[PDB]
Design an enzyme around this catalytic site. Structure first.
Site, PDB file in Angstrom:
ATOM      1  CB  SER A  10     -17.993 -55.515 -19.767  1.00 57.18           C
ATOM      2  OG  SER A  10     -18.450 -55.565 -18.430  1.00 57.18           O
ATOM      3  CG  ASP A  45     -22.360 -41.410 -32.871  1.00 52.84           C
ATOM      4  OD1 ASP A  45     -22.216 -42.220 -31.944  1.00 52.84           O
ATOM      5  OD2 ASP A  45     -22.863 -41.707 -33.982  1.00 52.84           O
TER       6      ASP A  45
END
EC number: 3.4.23.22
Length: 330
Positions: free
Chosen positions: A199, A35
């Protein structure tokens, strides 16, 4: 040193991935959920409340000659999906894919929430976010990656998750055969303890690319792609019959649909998520309403590039002094 381990979807939907991890001496192999959005390595154990164990493999520290109680240390964690676990702490030898760390904090669960109990395939979590998020008290502990870093050939790990198929976590090297083209690297902020990046935009299907900054985290421990409501609405508007269902808890779509791809930007590069990756199947057995793999982050408080996005790429988690993230197509 390096390590290389195969990671395998737990079910037919790629709800999560498990990776075998050797703990203790002699080795006890547990299948852990790696994770990148948390920083605790915790396991089902001989100390876990018996009624909360249902099929998991447990770590038994009393059977490990290298286990030592970390006296006075406790831990307690809550995840974004509302699940939780807590317990005490041992140090022991931990190996992943041939890479060994001695003195790793192995957090033994005394209590786990129902979601964990109900998932027989996940024996615990191995956190790969920054150690500043580790929950051990009163002495915060380091992640497996942090402990391994100085010994690694290069201070990196890579995630290469498969779509309905196994993939690979590598430590200490970049497998140049595992991706196509070049890797595009992008800046990371560690201010919140995550692999947080921005992004450069998105496209829906064959649509034009929208340049827009989307701050989010690369999180292998989250199944879906969670993005701003504007982006998510633009995606689902291209699927006939799709709608947001408050009763179901997100966007659903007719199972008869063909889903468009979703592209996200990494600098000037583009990662394309095929439409099929966005299908999470019937909301309940036999239903013709299917659950979407792109969902709104509104009210999460953060955008999450979870498995839906990451499995479309070869992803480099660069833990150099100034961390960065790399993405390549594959």
């Amino acid at each position: 040193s390096t390590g290389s381990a195969t990671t395998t979807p737990i079910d037919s939907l790629d709800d999560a991935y498990i990776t075998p991890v050797q703990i203790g001496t002699p080795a006890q192999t547990l299948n852990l959920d790696f994770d990148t959005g948390s920083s605790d390595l915790w396991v089902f154990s001989s100390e876990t409340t018996a009624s909360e164990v249902d099929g998991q493999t447990i770590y038994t520290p009393s059977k490990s000659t290298t286990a030592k109680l970390l006296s006075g240390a406790t831990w307690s964690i809550s995840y974004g999906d509302g699940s939780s676990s807590s317990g005490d702490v041992y140090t022991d030898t931990v190996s992943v894919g041939g890479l060994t760390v001695t003195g790793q904090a192995v957090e033994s669960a005394k209590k786990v929430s129902s979601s964990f109990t109900e998932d027989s395939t996940i024996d615990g979590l191995l956190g790969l976010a920054f150690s500043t998020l580790n929950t051990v008290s009163p002495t915060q502990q380091k992640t497996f990656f942090d402990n391994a870093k100085a010994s690694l050939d290069s201070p990196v790990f890579t995630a290469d998750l498969g779509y309905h198929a196994p993939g690979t976590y590598n430590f200490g090297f970049i497998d140049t055969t595992a991706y196509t083209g070049s890797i595009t690297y992008t800046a990371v902020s560690t201010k919140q303890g995550f692999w947080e990046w921005t992004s450069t935009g998105y496209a829906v299907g064959s649509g034009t690319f929208k340049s827009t900054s989307i701050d989010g985290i690369a999180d292998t421990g989250t199944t879906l792609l969670y993005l701003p409501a504007t982006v998510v609405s633009a995606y689902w508007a291209q699927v006939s019959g799709a709608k947001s269902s408050s009763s179901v808890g997100g966007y659903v779509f007719p199972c008869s649909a063909t889903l468009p791809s979703f592209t996200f930007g990494v600098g000037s590069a583009r990662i394309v998520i095929p439409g099929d990756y966005i299908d999470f199947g019937p909301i309940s057995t036999g239903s013709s309403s299917c659950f979407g793999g792109i969902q709104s982050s509104a009210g999460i408080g953060i955008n999450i590039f979870g498995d839906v996005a990451l499995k479309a790429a070869f992803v480099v988690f660069n833990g150099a002094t100034t961390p960065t993230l790399g993405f390549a197509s594959k």
